[PDB]
Amino acid sequence: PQITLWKRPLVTIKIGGQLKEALLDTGADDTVIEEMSLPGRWKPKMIGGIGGFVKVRQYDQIIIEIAGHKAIGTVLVGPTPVNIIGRNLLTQIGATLNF
């Protein structure tokens, strides 16, 4: 698909058996999802943006289905106001910015 940016680029994802809406965000280095349980080991991380930093849990080797495409990578879980698909997974689905 070709997604225009007149509105927020929101897509459905499936993660841990759950359907969520997420923003495709080229300015996010990594994917961060609202609080949920994920399998496996995690370690703490701080991520920062407008308004400062938030503490998240970093899970590796997580599979997400993004607008029907599967990708695997690191997912950060924490108190984000919006689910964000970041570059670490956008690359895997072949997403590019074009102008």
**Which chain residues interact with ligand 478 by CB under 6 A?**
23, 25, 27-30, 32, 47-50, 81-82, 84, 86
Cα separation, 89 vs 99, whole angstroms: 21
Residue 44 or 49 having the CB closest to ligand 478: 49
Does the protein bind a second copy through residue 36 (CB under 8 A)? Answer: no
What DSSP state is assigned to residue 26? T
Active site residue 29: no
Q: What are residue 66's DSSP bridge partners?
A: 13, 69
* Closest approach of ligand 478 to the CB of residue 24, in Å: 10
b/e code 19-37 from CB counts within 10 Å (16+ = b): eeebebbeebebbbbeeee
Interface ranges with a second copy (CB under 8 A)? 1-6, 8-9, 23-29, 32, 47-54, 67, 69, 80-82, 84, 87, 90-91, 93-99
